[PDB]
C-alpha cells in the first residue's frame, strides 16, 4: 500500500494560475523519486501539497497515512512530524551548535529528552559530522550545513523525507556527498522525494523520475533519465 497517493489533484492559485492540473502519483514506502521539470512547472506546489502548506482544490491526497482532504487544522502538526522537509533555503539556528540544532528538532515535536543524546549522536555518525558536534552553522561549509539540515529533517525518523534542490548551491564533490547521505537514508527505508535540476545526479544515481510540465505529469519512469536541457 502506498505512502503517498495523489489522484487527479488540482491546485489553482487565486490569480487564476492552475499550478497542478490533474496530477496522479502513487509512491510506495521506501521509494526514491526525483521530481524534475522546467521552472514554473509546479514542482514546489507539488512538494508543498505533501505537507499541507498547499491545500488542494480537487482530487484525493494521502501522505504518511493522513488524508489531506479531511485533515483538521489542529492536526497538521501531526502530519508534519511524519514528513521531514529540507527547505531549499534551509537555515539552521545560528546561535545553536550542531548538537543543539539537531536536538531542538526532537524537543520541538515533544520527544522525551531521554531519547535525545543517543539519537543526535547516531544521526551525526550517519552524516559523518561527529567532529562538528560543537560547531555553529557559520563555521560549517555549505555542504556541511546541508548535511546538518538533513540530520534535523530525519531526526524523528519520519516516514517521508522531502528535499527541495538539496545540492542546488553545492559543487560536484559536495553534491555527491549529499546524495550519498540521501541514498543511505533511503536504504534504511525512508521514502525520499527530491526536486532537482542536476542531470548528472539523476542520470548516474538512477531512481524513479517524475517529470512535471504546466501542471501535468508528462513522464514517470523507473531508473529514469533526466530528459531536459536545463
Ligand atoms: N503563491 C503563488 N501564488 C500564485 N501563483 C503561484 C504561487 N506559487 C506558484 N505560483 C504559480 O504556479 C505555477 C507553478 O509554480 P511552482 O510550483 O513554484 O513551480 P516550480 O517549482 O516548478 O518552479 C507557476 O505558474 C507559478 O507562477
Numbering used by the authors: 1 to 230
The authors write:
Two different crystal forms in complex with ADP were obtained in the same crystallization conditions belonging to two different space groups, P 1 and P 21. P 1 crystals contain one molecule per asymmetric unit and diffract up to 1.36 Å resolution, while P 21 crystals contain three molecules per asymmetric unit and diffract up to 1.57 Å resolution. Unless otherwise indicated, the description of the monomer structure provided here is for the highest-resolution crystal form belonging to space group P 1. FtsE binds ADP by both van der Waals and polar interactions. The position of the K43 side chain, essential for nucleotide binding through interaction with the β-phosphate, is stabilized by H bonds with main-chain oxygen atoms of G37 and P38. The switch histidine (H197) that stabilizes the transition-state geometry in the ADP-bound state interacts with the β-phosphate through two interspersed water molecules. The A-loop provides an aromatic side chain (Y13) that packs against the purine ring of adenine involving a π-stacking interaction and positions the base and ribose of the nucleotide. This interaction provides an additional binding free energy for ADP through an extensive hydrophobic interaction that buries 48.4 Å2 of surface area (calculated with PDBePISA v1.52) between its aromatic ring and the adenine base of ADP.
FtsEX is a membrane complex widely conserved across diverse bacterial genera and involved in critical processes such as recruitment of division proteins and in spatial and temporal regulation of muralytic activity during cell division or sporulation. The component FtsX is an integral membrane protein, whereas FtsE is an ATPase and is required for the transmission of a conformational signal from the cytosol through the membrane to regulate the activity of cell wall hydrolases in the periplasm. Here, we provide the first three-dimensional (3D) structure of FtsE from the notorious pathogen S. pneumoniae, and we show that it presents all the conserved structural motifs of the NBD members of the ABC transporter family. The nucleotide-binding site is located in lobe I near the interface between the two lobes and presents the nucleotide sandwiched between the Walker A and B motifs.
